[PDB]
Design a protein around this motif. Structure first.
Motif, short mmCIF file in Angstrom:
data_model
loop_
_atom_site.label_atom_id
_atom_site.label_comp_id
_atom_site.label_asym_id
_atom_site.label_seq_id
_atom_site.Cartn_x
_atom_site.Cartn_y
_atom_site.Cartn_z
N UNK A 1 -3.48 18.74 18.48
CA UNK A 1 -3.09 19.50 16.94
C UNK A 1 -2.87 18.44 15.44
N UNK A 2 -4.25 18.17 14.98
CA UNK A 2 -4.16 17.54 13.75
C UNK A 2 -5.60 16.63 15.36
N UNK A 3 -6.11 16.77 15.33
CA UNK A 3 -7.07 16.22 16.48
C UNK A 3 -8.38 14.63 15.13
N UNK A 4 -8.29 15.33 13.98
CA UNK A 4 -8.73 14.41 13.61
C UNK A 4 -10.62 14.15 13.72
N UNK A 5 -11.50 13.31 14.18
CA UNK A 5 -12.52 13.51 14.96
C UNK A 5 -12.40 13.51 16.12
N UNK A 6 -11.45 13.80 16.58
CA UNK A 6 -11.70 14.05 18.88
C UNK A 6 -11.42 12.63 18.67
N UNK A 7 -10.82 11.35 18.98
CA UNK A 7 -10.59 10.60 19.84
C UNK A 7 -9.00 10.84 20.75
N UNK A 8 -8.38 11.70 20.68
CA UNK A 8 -7.17 12.38 21.64
C UNK A 8 -7.80 13.67 22.34
N UNK A 9 -9.08 14.44 21.99
CA UNK A 9 -9.59 14.80 21.90
C UNK A 9 -10.89 14.45 23.41
N UNK B 1 -6.70 14.14 2.49
CA UNK B 1 -7.75 14.43 3.36
C UNK B 1 -8.05 13.40 3.36
N UNK B 2 -7.96 12.14 5.18
CA UNK B 2 -8.06 11.47 5.04
C UNK B 2 -9.73 11.02 5.40
N UNK B 3 -10.38 10.21 4.96
CA UNK B 3 -11.46 9.64 4.67
C UNK B 3 -12.07 8.92 5.66
N UNK B 4 -13.61 8.70 6.28
CA UNK B 4 -14.22 8.82 7.39
C UNK B 4 -13.39 7.76 7.67
N UNK B 5 -13.67 6.30 7.30
CA UNK B 5 -13.31 5.22 7.47
C UNK B 5 -12.44 5.14 8.07
N UNK C 1 1.05 -0.68 0.30
CA UNK C 1 0.03 -0.11 0.15
C UNK C 1 1.09 1.89 -0.04
N UNK C 2 0.36 2.39 -0.22
CA UNK C 2 0.88 3.57 -0.07
C UNK C 2 0.83 4.01 0.78
N UNK C 3 1.82 4.85 1.64
CA UNK C 3 1.91 5.04 2.99
C UNK C 3 1.15 6.75 2.92
N UNK C 4 0.15 6.44 4.24
CA UNK C 4 -0.86 7.63 4.09
C UNK C 4 -0.43 9.13 3.91
N UNK C 5 -0.88 9.90 3.46
CA UNK C 5 0.05 11.53 3.95
C UNK C 5 -1.47 12.11 4.40
N UNK D 1 -7.66 21.05 13.72
CA UNK D 1 -7.75 19.45 12.86
C UNK D 1 -8.00 20.79 11.40
N UNK D 2 -6.39 20.01 10.31
CA UNK D 2 -6.54 20.81 9.23
C UNK D 2 -7.79 20.96 7.86
N UNK D 3 -8.44 19.41 8.46
CA UNK D 3 -9.60 18.34 7.27
C UNK D 3 -10.82 18.75 7.64
N UNK D 4 -11.48 19.28 6.62
CA UNK D 4 -12.94 20.23 7.27
C UNK D 4 -13.94 19.10 7.21
N UNK D 5 -13.63 17.99 6.64
CA UNK D 5 -14.51 17.20 6.85
C UNK D 5 -14.58 16.87 8.03
N UNK D 6 -13.27 15.79 7.94
CA UNK D 6 -13.63 15.36 9.96
C UNK D 6 -13.78 16.81 11.15
N UNK D 7 -13.96 17.85 10.87
CA UNK D 7 -14.53 19.32 11.72
C UNK D 7 -15.85 19.25 11.48
#
Ligand SMILES: CSC[C@H]1O[C@@H](n2cnc3c(N)ncnc32)[C@H](O)[C@@H]1O
Ligand SMILES: Cc1cc(N)nc2cccnc12
Ligand SMILES: [Cl-]
Ligand SMILES: [Cl-]
Ligand SMILES: [Cl-]
Lengths: 299, 623
Positions: free
Chosen positions: B350-358, B304-308, B295-299, B378-384
């Motif tokens: 810093x880089x919270x995603x969907x807030x598991x660290x929150x 912008x990472x997907x919901x899944x 697999x290609x490593x994620x960036x 969070x940079x990704x606005x979909x995750x926001x």
């Protein structure tokens, strides 16, 4: 009813009746058979035979075991002992023992007549006890398929073997290390002891050379164009050497391996040859062309 | 359940033979497509003009049976590296004929022996069959662990078996295989059917086949010991090998005659070994499917990472209790008990995603009995959207969500603690160093960063399999060797670790330093004790969240049940021979311009490779 196209073995017993072994090397069914002909000139015709039987698998080699015993080397991995019944019409199985792991290619009976040795594609050589119906000894000496094994005619504990590992082993089971390697080269394919001279044998190679060998201590001739499949000395006091091949030719030879007779009547591989005990000039051959040819050798 | 076939060299009625074999419980049958002894002539008359049929009819079985159940075998007399020209020429024609007949039938695989050193002409003719017609048939090279010559009975008086250990000599059957597959240009269709003998060799001989494409394991009936009751079994040492092969999910062939009972018994034993093993652990259950899958490593910075993708990250609650604890410990070291009511700490995910660290920060504060102020950058606005819906529904004014890049964000106030999880399988492959450098201005002068430190590790590996998988990633409209100049995330499975992992690159946060430069150049020397073939370097990492709290995918120090991260792979273009005792010396650079970051690498010993991915030509990481 029908006898299988590919004739592998042919051997005369003491009285002059002809044993024929054969197998199907193509078609729907790959099985073998054993056949006794009391009129040799009647072979290969199935209707005019004295006795016949179907084996479940092919027939790579066989030999006589006395007068009514037929030892067989099958594709199944079993060495089989068939015997004739009390009036020589039926061919009944005495035993069929699955002990080799691959096609049993070669077989030969020892001098005593109560034991025999076999060689297989599994690379193993086994000495059999024919009364007890068991393997006494099993030797994994070779590094490749066992092509031919030939019992010493007179010494019950001795025999030859040859293989695709390029070795010729002179055995002697009285040693703690029985096998011994013998030099002269291309792979050895066939083996025959000299009947009168205890210390002499001949080997044919895959290149169509036949060569004479003394156990202590080497003449040789380019006889055939292809592999030497079988070697059978004649029953004369001064015996002639019949040499077979995959070039579909036969040559009978003298002491010094010069060429006397040549026969190209065979249209496929010449698989066995066998000399008549009654008429020493008469030599009988078989092959995959289904022919049973009878030659008159100019002796 | 184990997929298991029967190997025969004697088939009178293909119908009956199959039915017998199928009733015994075997999935398939290995058998001859022509007669083993039916030698043929293609040049010399009269033998060349032999009346047919040359073999059995294809009509004797169904197409489905030919496609699934039958494995063809090369005729034992076919010897195309014979010393005799005529045998050589006949064998070439015989081989093509047999292989072409197997193709005509649609056989799933076809067996061929490797039983001597020089199999050069066999390889040639096989390569030609492969570039002649269009067919999907596999080719299984029957090759033993130990050559028959080296296990022969010590019974030739004038040719005794040497009782001296020959290290490289005992591995000769691997070289038989290596030269064959090298000659055939590493075809994916050429695999190994490894044959086992009654006495196993030294471990380094068996270990030699790690990484190799073993599609089968052949077990001769003769290798089975008999027990008190009468069944076939194997020695404890053979079982170890079986369990190792079972992980490779090889197909088990049973060769030779029944020396024992049923045949189901030989098969039933394999089932008994298969039932009774250590079960698939919680890491390995998750990883089932992804074994050696590139697999290609994620960036997540550049993309912008997907919901899944975020959902996957969240299925590792072990990781977040480690984050919870690290934050919990930090709160106590900063806020003394008497100050607990007065002193509210400013935490910034810093880089919270969907807030598991929150949630881990809210919970760490609850368990610590200290008060906190949260910011969820969070940079990704979909995750926001996910955050802001959690933030309206539960969190309230305590959490401030910030839809911005941490490097761009003008902060209203400085942070006591910056928490983040911007770490890839190689730690710094998602550009956490560059991200946190930009966020560093809004850390208090005495502020902690969680994680405080992270280090990347590297280890040379041997997998001719994974080399082949990388090789198959050649794509249109790019450099035809680009696929070798880029990292891959992959659950490394069939491979050989050639040396213990040593550390590569390290970063600490906060980076208390004048001239901050994140580029690197590291030289490693790996001591190699085996004869092998280097195909790449596995990458792992380790991070210090806070004090003794750590996360690690380094195999020897691996954090418990953490399936989220898989190892990374830096392949090389050309495999390198490495002798026992030699040193693999690898070089790694980390590089960057204003716009992109990348790795370059090169092996310098025992021979030099080219510099891989120079100037990020084939691979970059987007800033
Ligand atoms: C849990 S994956 C780490 C998260 O960090 C976010 N991220 C990565 N780089 C940055 C950045 N520079 N600023 C803000 N968020 C980031 C990504 O969008 C991802 O959701
Ligand atoms: C959980 C997680 C975070 C991140 N920043 N990167 C990853 C890459 C692979 C797996 N998990 C990851
Ligand atoms: Cl095979
Ligand atoms: Cl990919
Ligand atoms: Cl660039």
């Amino acid at each position: 009813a029908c006898m299988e196209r590919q004739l592998e073995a042919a051997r005369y017993r003491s009285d002059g009746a002809l044993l024929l072994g054969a197998s199907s090397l193509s078609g729907r069914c790959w099985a073998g058979s054993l056949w006794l002909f009391k009129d040799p000139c009647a072979a290969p015709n199935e209707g005019f035979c004295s006795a016949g039987v179907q084996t479940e698998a092919g027939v790579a080699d066989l030999t006589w075991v006395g007068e009514r015993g037929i030892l067989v080397a099958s594709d199944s991995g079993a060495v089989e002992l068939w015997e004739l019944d009390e009036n020589e019409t039926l061919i009944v199985s005495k035993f069929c023992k699955y002990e080799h792991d691959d096609i049993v290619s070669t077989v030969s009976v020892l001098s005593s007549g109560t034991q025999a040795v076999s060689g297989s594609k599994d690379i193993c050589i086994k000495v059999w006890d024919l009364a007890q119906q068991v393997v006494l000894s099993s030797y994994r000496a070779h590094a490749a398929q066992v092509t031919c094994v030939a019992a010493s005619p007179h010494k019950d504990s001795v025999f030859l073997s040859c293989s695709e590992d390029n070795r010729i082993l002179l055995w002697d089971t009285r040693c703690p290390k029985p096998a011994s390697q013998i030099g002269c080269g291309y792979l050895p394919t066939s083996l025959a002891w000299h009947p009168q001279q205890s210390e002499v044998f001949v080997f044919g190679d895959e290149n169509g050379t036949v060569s004479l060998v003394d156990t202590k201590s080497v003449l040789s001739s380019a006889v055939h164009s292809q592999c030497v499949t079988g070697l059978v000395f004649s029953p004369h006091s001064v015996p002639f050497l019949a040499s077979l091949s995959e070039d579909c030719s036969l040559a009978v030879l003298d002491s010094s391996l010069s060429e006397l007779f040549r026969s190209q009547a065979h249209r496929d591989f010449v698989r066995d040859a066998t000399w008549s005990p009654l008429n020493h000039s008469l030599l009988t051959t078989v092959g995959w062309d289904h022919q049973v040819v009878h030659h008159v050798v100019p002796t | 359940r184990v997929s298991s076939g029967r190997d025969l060299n004697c088939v009178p009625e293909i119908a009956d033979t199959l039915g017998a074999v199928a009733k015994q419980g075997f999935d398939f049958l290995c058998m001859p497509v022509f007669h083993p002894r039916f030698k043929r002539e293609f040049i010399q008359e009269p033998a060349k003009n032999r009346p047919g049929p040359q073999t059995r009819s294809d009509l004797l079985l169904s197409g489905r049976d030919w496609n699934t159940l039958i494995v063809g075998k090369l005729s034992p007399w076919i010897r195309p590296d014979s010393k005799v020209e005529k045998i050589r020429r006949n064998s070439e024609a015989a081989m093509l004929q047999e292989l072409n007949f197997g193709a005509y039938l649609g056989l799933p695989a076809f067996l061929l022996p490797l039983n001597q050193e020089d199999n050069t002409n066999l390889a040639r003719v096989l390569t030609n069959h492969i570039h002649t017609g269009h067919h999907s048939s596999m080719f299984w090279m029957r090759v033993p662990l130990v050559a028959p010559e080296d296990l022969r009975d010590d019974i030739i008086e004038n040719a005794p078996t040497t009782h001296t250990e020959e290290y490289s000599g005992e591995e000769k059957t691997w070289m038989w295989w290596h030269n064959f597959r090298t000659l055939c240009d590493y075809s994916k269709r050429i695999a190994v059917a490894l044959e086992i003998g009654a006495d196993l060799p030294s471990n380094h001989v068996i270990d030699r086949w790690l990484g190799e494409p073993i599609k089968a394991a052949i077990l001769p009936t003769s290798i089975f010991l008999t027990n008190k009751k009468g069944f076939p079994v194997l020695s404890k040492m053979h079982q170890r090998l079986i369990f190792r092969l079972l992980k490779l999910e090889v197909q088990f062939i049973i060769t030779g005659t029944n020396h024992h009972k049923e045949f189901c018994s030989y098969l039933q034993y394999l089932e008994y070994l298969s039932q009774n093993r250590p079960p698939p652990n919680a890491y390995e259950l998750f990883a089932k499917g992804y074994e050696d899958y590139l697999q290609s490593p994620l960036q997540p910075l550049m993309d912008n990472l997907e919901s899944q993708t975020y959902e996957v990250f969240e299925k590792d609650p072990i990781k977040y209790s480690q984050y919870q604890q690290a934050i919990y410990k930090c709160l106590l070291d900063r806020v003394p008990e008497e100050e607990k009511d007065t002193n509210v700490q400013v935490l910034m995910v810093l880089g919270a995603g969907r807030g598991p660290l929150v949630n881990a920060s809210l919970r760490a504060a609850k368990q610590a009995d200290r008060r906190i102020k949260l910011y969820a950058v969070e940079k990704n606005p979909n995750a926001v959207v996910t955050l802001e819906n959690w933030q309206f529904e539960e969190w309230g004014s305590q959490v401030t969500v910030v839809s911005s890049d941490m490097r761009e964000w003008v902060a209203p106030e400085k942070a006591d603690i910056i928490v983040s999880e911007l770490l890839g399988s190689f730690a710094d492959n998602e550009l956490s160093p560059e991200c946190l450098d930009g966020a560093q201005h809004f850390l208090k002068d005495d502020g902690v960063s969680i994680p405080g430190e992270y280090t990347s590790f590297l280890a040379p590996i041997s997998s001719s399999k994974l080399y082949n998988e990388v090789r198959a990633c050649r794509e249109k409209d790019r450099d035809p060797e680009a696929q070798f100049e880029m990292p891959y995330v992959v659950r490394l499975h069939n491979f050989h670790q050639l040396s213990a992992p040593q550390p590569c690159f390290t970063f600490s946060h906060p980076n208390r330093d004048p001239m901050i430069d994140n580029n690197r150049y590291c030289t490693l020397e790996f001591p190699v004790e085996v004869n092998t073939v280097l195909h790449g370097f596995a990458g792992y990492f380790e991070t210090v969240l806070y004090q003794d709290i750590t996360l690690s995918i380094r195999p020897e120090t691996h954090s418990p049940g953490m399936f989220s991260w898989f190892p990374i792979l830096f392949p090389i273009k050309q495999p390198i021979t490495v002798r026992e005792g030699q040193t693999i010396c690898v070089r790694f650079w980390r590089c960057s311009n204003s716009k992109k970051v990348w790795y370059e690498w090169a092996v310098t010993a025992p021979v030099c490779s080219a510099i891989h991915n120079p100037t990020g030509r084939s691979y970059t990481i987007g800033l």
